[PDB]
Enzyme design. Structure first.
Site, PDB file in Angstrom:
ATOM      1  N   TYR A 120     -59.231 -82.945  72.118  1.00  0.00           N
ATOM      2  CA  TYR A 120     -59.817 -82.933  70.784  1.00  0.00           C
ATOM      3  C   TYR A 120     -60.566 -84.215  70.439  1.00  0.00           C
ATOM      4  O   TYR A 120     -61.111 -84.316  69.335  1.00  0.00           O
ATOM      5  CB  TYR A 120     -58.720 -82.674  69.751  1.00  0.00           C
ATOM      6  CG  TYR A 120     -58.087 -81.315  69.911  1.00  0.00           C
ATOM      7  CD1 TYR A 120     -58.786 -80.162  69.590  1.00  0.00           C
ATOM      8  CD2 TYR A 120     -56.799 -81.183  70.403  1.00  0.00           C
ATOM      9  CE1 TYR A 120     -58.214 -78.917  69.744  1.00  0.00           C
ATOM     10  CE2 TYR A 120     -56.218 -79.944  70.559  1.00  0.00           C
ATOM     11  CZ  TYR A 120     -56.931 -78.814  70.229  1.00  0.00           C
ATOM     12  OH  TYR A 120     -56.356 -77.574  70.383  1.00  0.00           O
ATOM     13  N   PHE A 123     -49.779 -81.483  79.506  1.00  0.00           N
ATOM     14  CA  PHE A 123     -49.353 -80.095  79.391  1.00  0.00           C
ATOM     15  C   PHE A 123     -48.575 -79.704  80.634  1.00  0.00           C
ATOM     16  O   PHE A 123     -48.925 -80.116  81.741  1.00  0.00           O
ATOM     17  CB  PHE A 123     -50.553 -79.164  79.214  1.00  0.00           C
ATOM     18  CG  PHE A 123     -51.187 -79.248  77.861  1.00  0.00           C
ATOM     19  CD1 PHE A 123     -50.701 -78.500  76.806  1.00  0.00           C
ATOM     20  CD2 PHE A 123     -52.274 -80.074  77.646  1.00  0.00           C
ATOM     21  CE1 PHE A 123     -51.286 -78.577  75.562  1.00  0.00           C
ATOM     22  CE2 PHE A 123     -52.863 -80.154  76.404  1.00  0.00           C
ATOM     23  CZ  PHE A 123     -52.369 -79.405  75.361  1.00  0.00           C
ATOM     24  N   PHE A 126     -45.739 -81.452  70.942  1.00  0.00           N
ATOM     25  CA  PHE A 126     -46.448 -80.955  69.774  1.00  0.00           C
ATOM     26  C   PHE A 126     -46.739 -79.464  69.816  1.00  0.00           C
ATOM     27  O   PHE A 126     -47.107 -78.901  68.781  1.00  0.00           O
ATOM     28  CB  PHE A 126     -47.775 -81.711  69.585  1.00  0.00           C
ATOM     29  CG  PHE A 126     -48.780 -81.465  70.674  1.00  0.00           C
ATOM     30  CD1 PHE A 126     -49.639 -80.384  70.613  1.00  0.00           C
ATOM     31  CD2 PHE A 126     -48.869 -82.321  71.756  1.00  0.00           C
ATOM     32  CE1 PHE A 126     -50.562 -80.159  71.609  1.00  0.00           C
ATOM     33  CE2 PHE A 126     -49.791 -82.100  72.755  1.00  0.00           C
ATOM     34  CZ  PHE A 126     -50.638 -81.017  72.682  1.00  0.00           C
ATOM     35  N   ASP A 127     -46.589 -78.810  70.965  1.00  0.00           N
ATOM     36  CA  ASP A 127     -46.851 -77.383  71.063  1.00  0.00           C
ATOM     37  C   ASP A 127     -46.084 -76.814  72.245  1.00  0.00           C
ATOM     38  O   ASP A 127     -45.786 -77.518  73.212  1.00  0.00           O
ATOM     39  CB  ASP A 127     -48.348 -77.096  71.215  1.00  0.00           C
ATOM     40  CG  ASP A 127     -48.699 -75.655  70.914  1.00  0.00           C
ATOM     41  OD1 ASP A 127     -47.822 -74.917  70.421  1.00  0.00           O
ATOM     42  OD2 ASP A 127     -49.854 -75.260  71.167  1.00  0.00           O
ATOM     43  N   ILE A 159     -59.608 -75.908  75.150  1.00  0.00           N
ATOM     44  CA  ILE A 159     -60.252 -77.192  75.386  1.00  0.00           C
ATOM     45  C   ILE A 159     -60.753 -77.265  76.828  1.00  0.00           C
ATOM     46  O   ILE A 159     -60.303 -76.525  77.714  1.00  0.00           O
ATOM     47  CB  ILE A 159     -59.304 -78.360  75.068  1.00  0.00           C
ATOM     48  CG1 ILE A 159     -57.943 -78.166  75.739  1.00  0.00           C
ATOM     49  CG2 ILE A 159     -59.127 -78.499  73.566  1.00  0.00           C
ATOM     50  CD1 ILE A 159     -57.041 -79.375  75.647  1.00  0.00           C
ATOM     51  N   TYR A 190     -46.963 -72.674  78.464  1.00  0.00           N
ATOM     52  CA  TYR A 190     -47.274 -74.094  78.448  1.00  0.00           C
ATOM     53  C   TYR A 190     -46.401 -74.821  77.438  1.00  0.00           C
ATOM     54  O   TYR A 190     -45.881 -74.232  76.488  1.00  0.00           O
ATOM     55  CB  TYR A 190     -48.752 -74.338  78.118  1.00  0.00           C
ATOM     56  CG  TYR A 190     -49.106 -74.055  76.678  1.00  0.00           C
ATOM     57  CD1 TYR A 190     -49.460 -72.780  76.268  1.00  0.00           C
ATOM     58  CD2 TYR A 190     -49.089 -75.065  75.728  1.00  0.00           C
ATOM     59  CE1 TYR A 190     -49.784 -72.518  74.956  1.00  0.00           C
ATOM     60  CE2 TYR A 190     -49.411 -74.812  74.414  1.00  0.00           C
ATOM     61  CZ  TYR A 190     -49.759 -73.537  74.034  1.00  0.00           C
ATOM     62  OH  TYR A 190     -50.081 -73.281  72.724  1.00  0.00           O
TER      63      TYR A 190
END
Ligand SMILES: Nc1ncnc2c1ncn2[C@@H]1O[C@H](COP(=O)(O)OP(=O)(O)OP(=O)(O)O)[C@@H](O)[C@H]1O
Lengths: 48, 806, 107, 144
Positions: free
Chosen positions: C82, C99, C36-37, C56, C26
């Site tokens: 979140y 994502f 961010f990831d 999540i 991902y």
């Protein structure tokens, strides 16, 4: 938005045939053009 | 990226066939995937240039261009009326794949540096013959008109029969049959009329171009003898061409040049007539479709066709000379072209500033693959990117096109180079001298000195540098591999000079003068432009005023100026669904922000554009107007039409100051300032404008998350040009509240130090990557097309400036 | 919430079931497009068990709808992400996440 | 040519007569190359031929050249220098010492024949002596 951001990115390049078409008043160029691209191999994630 | 619906949506995968159609009449661009329509189109985009097929990719791809004909068989039928792209290859070109705007290439002995490429323009396909309608033939030329009309056909028919053409019922090239190969007086009426008008047009253009011609002989006129053609040159119907024999007529060089001009004019007249009749160009002739391989302006014609036309026109000139007329070529009127700005045209490549040498004896080589405009030598680290090499005192270079040494100007020096010649550049920082050699021989000045420059102040050091003009190719060898140097041993090794990169474990990094206009802060010492930060008074908001320092004086620079503010305003991620004292609730709940531009009296409003730009604006247009703004509409709809959305995308949202000049005031210099206010609603995407407090009709709509910089484009006409006023209006917040988070709820106008005026600079230094993607292009076959392959990955660590989206 | 938009098709048959370990690759971005990831940055697939509340809610449901071998874009709202707390220092409060998830395998 | 230049440097009537000849005959030394001691054909020809002389000496012999120049500055005779070099050949440079010597000697060995020769002490001393004498007298000429 304040600090400078860093990241690893891929290099990207472009390739063209030497075919140039356009429109202008009195131009000698045809107005409708067509071409195709066939995809043989694609590695979706060769890098990250 | 705007999602577009197609059956079986998926990112391009193996065995996918993408069909792209371009209709320049709308204009529109449409796509098909595996024969299925892509429910989306580009339209209403700018048409000031030439379009080409293009594929962009990263490593890990293998694709094939299918262009029709023998250059890739189409897998799907082109939509009706569309032409295969292979037909667009120009007469003096061969179809192949190439990169776009490359400053670097591979070559037998290493990387080759490449200057700018000379690109054609859409206006280069418009034939522009010299205007000859008012040229009334004087009696002599009018008399010779008919004789030329017949003799041209005679010569043409002789050539036709010599090359094979024989008479027949129809234009059967297969059987070599020509129906028009008959006596001129019996030629079909249309072609005869065209031949007659062209024959007269020859004399008419002769006069129009500036020639002075009249009768000077009649005895020769009656003396000219006609060639008797045999049965071999006889037609199938018995027609025999009658080209008059004039073997006594000589020629002159200016007359040959005029013959070339006449051939150009004739071909352009023919092309204009055919375009008016509705013909067009095509690499493959299609008479039923009115497509011709020669329907292109003379300059773009193939060499053989040019030679044939020139031969015919030279024969015509010879016939007139044999008649005895005194064809006197006009005088030459010099003219300049300077297609672009020279200071920003040639690409400069220099070593990285950290390699500057402040002592020692250093040597390097530069091979001139071409023989055009190229300079090579040494530069100071602070070399500017927008100045010609050696125009200022920041570089000592040698230009080998004609032979010159450049430093703070030009002087004759050395000799011109030939293709493949190697220039050895040496710098001796103990003697403070610079030496140039050509193929191992030291180049000498006219005085005979063997040093190109002397008394050089070391200063901050020196770097290898070169400059390549448009269409030029060089090879810079800094001597990392000493054995690769070709003339170091002959000159420099025994003199004690050292290769520049002799003991470097890695190749020397280089930078080049990238010609992509970019916004940079106005220099504090700019010779022409000054920006004054004015504090807000009781009746005035904070302001940034531009003044022209050198206005109304010798050396004054007057040119289009593109200014923006350093910080952008960002529209909200989600848009809303569907006295003079601010009311606190309204002012603390509003999402509308305002900023004004004051155009001082004496600054023509017709020369000012006020509004916003996106981070993507890069147009340094010296003849800017709102019609040059990039724009395109993306339209998405159903499989059965029924447009869903039509989004307009652009990078410049401005109003023209000329829209607010009253017709009464037009033509007169007003004595009142013009204040143009710009309002943006960050929660709805709407942008509106006001002029002197009156709302204007211009409005714009942008998408959420858009970044807009306040911008002003102006051609100065006064010492006081413009003023960014960062004020507010009733119940409307100032720009500071949108720009700075800490001021989000502060209605007091502010101009913090970060907010400043930036101007568009045409050229900037950019670091060349040490490694480049290896792309392989080849013709796979007559049916497979042209294959492009890239397999080896290549990544870089990118540093991103958030506010500039760069 | 979570919207799933296919990028590359999967097999169309094998869908994750509760208790199965999904192995995925991902890349995560904010709505405005800031990454961010990414598991591809660490060069190691991310493994999570369905129904164990390890990831999540948006991820749980989206990967549940995803099929083996499929690449898809998951758009997850704040409530399925979140939420108001966010991820201090990484994800701002009330942030929609995007994502690019590839379902490598099930085990 | 170096011997002739050395004679010119040593003798003083040589320089004076060269100056008188050039001044009287009004010879255009600039034209010849294409009044001034720089334009003196005697030194100009030696300067043009000097690269050939240097090409005989290997990069390692640079230190021996410096020592020979120092002796000639001390006014030693040719045999004295030829014996100095013969007896301190051990002061020859070593490639490992400097990185510059590495690539200089690489080029020298790459040149055919140059690597084949220079294995003889007599050849080494002769080369160093001659080139050092020429370089010394060139230094004297250039110095005012
Ligand atoms: N390629 C061209 N370049 C310049 N002029 C041209 C060209 N093609 C046609 N023309 C003009 O049109 C005339 C056409 O040729 P010409 O009159 O000799 O015979 P035609 O039988 O009418 O033509 P075609 O050769 O097409 O059968 C040329 O004489 C010239 O005036």
């Amino acid at each position: 938005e304040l600090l400078l951001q860093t990241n690893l990115i891929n290099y990207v390049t472009s390739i063209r045939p030497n075919i140039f078409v356009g429109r202008a008043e009195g131009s000698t160029q045809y107005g409708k053009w067509y071409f195709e691209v066939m995809v043989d191999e694609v590695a979706p994630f060769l890098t990250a | 990226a705007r999602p577009v619906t197609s059956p079986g949506q998926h990112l391009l995968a193996p065995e996918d066939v993408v069909s792209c159609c371009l209709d320049l009449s709308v204009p529109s661009i449409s796509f098909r995937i595996n024969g299925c329509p892509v429910q989306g189109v580009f339209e209403s985009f700018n048409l000031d240039g030439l379009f080409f097929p293009v594929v962009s990719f990263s490593a890990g791809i293998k694709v094939r261009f299918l262009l029709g004909g023998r250059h890739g068989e189409f897998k799907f039928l082109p939509p009706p009326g569309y032409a295969p792209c292979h037909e667009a290859v120009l007469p003096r070109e061969r179809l192949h794949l190439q990169p776009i705007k490359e400053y670097r290439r591979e070559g037998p002995r290493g990387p080759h540096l490449v200057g700018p490429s000379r690109c054609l323009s859409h206006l280069d396909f418009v034939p522009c013959p010299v205007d000859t309608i008012q040229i009334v033939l004087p009696p002599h030329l009018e008399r010779i008109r008919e004789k030329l009309a017949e003799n041209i056909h005679e010569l043409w028919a002789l050539t036709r029969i010599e090359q094979g053409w024989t008479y027949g019922p129809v234009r059967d090239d297969n059987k070599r049959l020509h129906p028009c190969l008959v006596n001129f007086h019996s030629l079909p009426e249309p072609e005869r009329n065209y031949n007659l008008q062209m024959s007269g047009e020859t004399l008419k253009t002769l006069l129009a171009l500036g020639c002075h011609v009249g009768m000077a002989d009649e005895k020769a006129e009656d003396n000219l003898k006609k060639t008797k053609l045999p049965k071999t040159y006889m037609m199938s119907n018995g027609y025999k061409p009658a080209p008059l024999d004039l073997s006594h007529v000589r020629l002159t060089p200016a007359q040959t040049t005029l013959v070339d001009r006449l051939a150009e004019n004739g071909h352009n007249v023919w092309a204009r007539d055919r375009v008016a009749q509705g013909w067009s160009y095509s690499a493959v002739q299609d008479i039923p479709a009115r497509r011709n391989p020669r329907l292109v302006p003379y300059r773009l014609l193939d060499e053989a066709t040019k030679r044939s036309n020139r031969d015919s026109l030279c024969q015509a000139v010879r016939t007139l000379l044999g008649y005895g007329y005194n064809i006197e070529p006009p005088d030459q009127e010099p003219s300049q072209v300077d297609s672009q700005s020279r200071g920003d045209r040639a690409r400069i490549f220099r070593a990285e500033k950290s390699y500057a040498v402040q002592s020692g004896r250093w040597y390097f080589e530069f091979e001139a693959v071409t023989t055009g405009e190229m300079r090579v030598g040494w530069a100071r680290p602070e070399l500017r990117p927008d100045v010609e090499l050696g125009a200022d005192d920041l570089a000592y270079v040698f230009n080998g096109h004609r032979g010159q040494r450049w430093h703070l100007g030009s002087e004759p020096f050395g000799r011109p180079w030939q293709s493949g010649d190697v220039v050895g550049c040496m710098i001796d920082l103990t003697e403070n001298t610079i030496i140039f050699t050509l193929n191992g021989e030291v180049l000498m000045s006219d005085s005979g000195s063997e040093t190109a420059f002397r008394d050089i102040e070391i200063g901050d050091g020196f770097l290898p540098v070169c400059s390549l003009g448009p269409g030029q190719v060089g090879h810079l060898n800094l001597g990392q591999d000493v054995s690769s140097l070709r003339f170091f041993a002959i000159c420099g090794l025994q003199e004690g000079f050292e290769p520049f990169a002799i003991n470097m474990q890695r190749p020397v990094t280089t930078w080049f003068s990238k010609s992509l206009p970019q916004f940079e802060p106005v220099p504090l010492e700019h010779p022409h432009y000054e920006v004054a930060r004015m504090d807000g008074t009781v009746d005035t908001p904070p302001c940034l005023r531009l003044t022209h320092r050198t206005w109304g004086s010798q050396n004054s620079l007057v040119e289009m100026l593109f200014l923006r503010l350093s910080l952008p305003v960002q529209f909200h991620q989600h848009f809303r669904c569907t006295d003079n004292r601010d009311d606190p609730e309204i002012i603390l709940n509003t999402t509308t922000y305002y900023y004004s531009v004051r155009v001082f009296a004496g600054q023509e409003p017709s020369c000012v554009w006020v509004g916003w730009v996106t981070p993507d604006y890069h147009q340094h247009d010296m003849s800017f107007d709102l019609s040059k703004v990039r724009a395109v509409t993306v339209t998405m709809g159903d499989e059965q039409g029924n447009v869903h959305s039509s989004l307009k995308c652009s990078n410049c949202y401005m109003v023209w100051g000329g829209d607010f000049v009253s017709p009464g005031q037009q033509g007169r210099i007003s004595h009142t300032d013009l204040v143009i206010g710009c309002l943006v609603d960050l929660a709805t995407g709407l942008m509106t404008f006001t002029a002197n407090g009156k709302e204007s009709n211009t409005f714009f709509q942008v998408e959420p998350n858009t970044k807009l910089f306040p911008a002003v484009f102006v051609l100065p006409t006064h010492q006081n040009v413009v003023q960014f006023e960062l004020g507010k209006q009733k119940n409307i917040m100032p720009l500071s509240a949108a720009m700075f988070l800490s001021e989000r709820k502060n209605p007091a106008p502010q101009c913090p130090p970060r907010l400043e005026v930036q101007m568009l600079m045409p050229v900037s230094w950019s670091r060349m990557p040490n490694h480049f993607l290896q792309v392989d292009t080849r013709r796979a076959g007559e049916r497979l097309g042209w294959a492009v392959q890239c397999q080896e990955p290549l990544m870089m660590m990118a540093l991103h400036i958030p506010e500039e989206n760069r | 919430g979570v919207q799933v938009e296919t990028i590359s098709p999967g097999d169309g048959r094998t869908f994750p079931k509760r208790g199965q370990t999904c192995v995925v690759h991902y890349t995560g971005m904010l709505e405005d497009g800031k990454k961010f990831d990414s598991s591809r940055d660490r060069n190691k697939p991310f493994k999570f068990t369905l129904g164990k509340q390890e990831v999540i809610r948006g991820w749980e449901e989206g990967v549940a709808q995803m099929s083996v071998g499929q690449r898809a874009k998951l758009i997850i709202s704040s409530d399925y992400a979140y939420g108001a707390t966010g991820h201090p220092g990484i994800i701002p409060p009330h942030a929609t996440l995007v994502f690019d998830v590839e379902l490598l395998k099930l085990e | 040519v170096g011997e002739i230049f050395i004679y010119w440097s040593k003798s003083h009537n040589f320089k004076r007569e060269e100056q008188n000849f050039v001044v009287q005959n009004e010879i255009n030394n600039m034209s010849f190359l294409t009044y001034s001691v720089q334009t003196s054909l005697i030194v100009a020809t030696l300067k043009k031929m000097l690269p050939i002389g240097l090409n005989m000496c290997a990069p390692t012999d640079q230190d021996l050249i410096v020592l020979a120049k120092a002796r000639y500055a001390l006014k030693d005779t040719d045999e004295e220098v030829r014996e100095f070099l013969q007896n301190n050949l051990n002061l020859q440079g070593k490639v490992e010492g400097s990185p510059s010597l590495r690539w200089q000697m690489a080029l020298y060995r790459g040149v055919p024949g140059r690597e084949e020769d220079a294995d003889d002490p007599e050849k080494i001393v002769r080369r160093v002596q001659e080139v050092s004498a020429v370089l010394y007298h060139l230094d004297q000429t250039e110095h005012p």
